[PDB]
């Protein structure tokens with residue numbers, strides 16, 4: 144009641160203001176915690192009433208941060224789980240609730256071992272004396288690299304995503320493990336791409352076409368990799384996979400303050416300039432070769448089957 | 462007279478039977494020796510009579526081995542040299558002959574230092590820790606590599622041209638110099654092409670389009686390099702440049718016995734099979750990035766200017 148609405152309002156304002164928490168897996172765990180806390184302390188007669196309640200509570204989290212699709216498609220996965228439980232019990236008050244409890248607990252068991260399974264199958268994609276190029280900062284790709292370097296000796300080009308230099312942290316965290324890393328800017332991507340053998344990047348949101356949004360400037364890396372014919376490896380979990388079509392809804396990119404691009408101390412020329420800072424970008428699925436999830440490697444021509452197995456077509460509007 | 466026609470007949474039968482001599486530079490030096498010997502021991506009143514005599518003597522060498530264009534376009538270069546001498550003396554018996562003597566001597570002075578100038582400018586195209594892939598056997602490319610390895614440390618993939626494995630000699634002659642070479646077949650070209658940074662090949666004949674014939678299977682290497690966007694380096698002298706257009710005349714490829722592909726001890730299935738062995742292939746000029754001659758690096762969109770500076774348009778039929 145009071146604590147429920149208090150924590151819901153706190154989560155909504157946390158998604159409205161900034162990125163809280165920092166890890167997307169931690170935000171997914173807090174999303175499952177919010178959904179189990181909202182189903183354990185409420186009352187319903189029909190399962191469709193709970194479906195409408197979860198939809199009404201998810202619309203606010205979607206309108207809080209539209210660029211954060213993880214809470215929205217996790218709400219949609221929990222909606223499909225509750226729909227499948229109502230379907231298997233339809234062909235109902237405490238038994239359905241206990242089934243929802245054990246299913247969301249099984250979802251946390253599956254979600255805690257996602258990066259572990261990605262690091263487990265990391266060995267079948269990296270050979271010795273290999274030139275790797277990445278962009279931005281992501282825990283999945285650096286875990287991939289620090290597991291692949293346990294038995295193999297290779298090189299990683301840590302290209303920074305530079306609206307704000309977050310890839311320096313990835314370069315330092317790899318060089319502490321000894322991956323023989325090299326730091327450059329966004330302007331040397333195609334200049335170094337003639338020596339890059341594979342492209343291993345992360346993403347923020349996998350779309351329904353197999354398209355993906357990620358840290359900005361990676362569409363340029365995908366174009367240079369398609370020019371030089373190198374395969375792209377997308378190490379991405381199964382909760383960044385969303386049924387939002389690219390040109391269907393607006394607010395695709397996330398815009399931040401232009402201070403990180405052009406500072407406030409520039410002068411009188413700030414009045415007559417328009418400085419936009421997209422921290423994301425669009426990558427079409429034909430520029431992608433392989434997706435790496437915790438269940439195995441999948442093609443961009445196979446994301447629709449995971450969409451059918453994880454999502455329901457009457458929930459794509461939410 | 463007798464010794465002249467004897468040596469002409471010997472050179473004609475040597476070009477009819479096989480490849481004699483083995484080096485193309487040695488054959489060019491013997492071509493200039495044959496042309497100076499045929500002009501020093503004969504009589505003419507007009508320069509056009511000598512032009513028709515050199516044309517009549519060059520038609521036999523062209524019909525001897527049509528795949529050996531070096532003697533034909535060297536005869537054509539000497540024809541343009543004698544035409545320019547007649548032009549500068551037109552705006553004449555011993556002075557024109559002495560001018561032809563000093564011009565062909567200057568042509569030998571320019572021809573002896575071709576591979577030396579290619580090895581001199583070899584340094585501005587090779588960097589350290591580089592993956593090079595070659596095909597066949599050629600003295601220019603191996604001289605390029607053994608000069609480039611005097612100050613740089615890199616790797617060469619010596620892919621064999623395999624109607625008959627001649628690239629093994631190139632691999633041994635490089636591994637005696639320590640280039641850290643690797644030997645494979647023609648079937649692993651696109652399999653290894655995802656780690657190849659540059660393609661450095663030789664050629665047999667540069668055509669008028671900028672197209673080239675070389676040791677066979679290099680069109681496949683050019684297609685794989687165009688797929689993986691690596692630049693092609695053609696280390697080729699300025700006497701393999703000929704005005705013969707690709708689709709203009711017949712007998713482009715040189716066919717040899719099918720014994721090197723399928724042996725005589727195969728059995729009864731040799732009666733009902735057609736085994737063809739082209740030891741050359743066609744490479745279009747859009748699959749080529751850069752030509753390396755002794756005067757400097759030139760584009761495939763610049764071969765026509767060397768054609769205008771070295772050849773005359775009334776001599777392309779010969």
Ligand SMILES: O=C(COc1ccc(Cl)cc1)N[C@H]1CC[C@H](NC(=O)COc2ccc(Cl)cc2)CC1
Nearest residue numbers: 272273274298325335338590591592616643653656
């Ligand atoms: O050391 C590096 C550093 O790479 C970079 C560092 C920085 C930048 Cl900006 C770009 C690239 N790269 C090595 C990676 C192995 C390669 N190849 C080999 O060592 C051997 O190559 C072979 C050998 C055999 C075959 Cl069949 C194919 C390739 C040499 C260059």
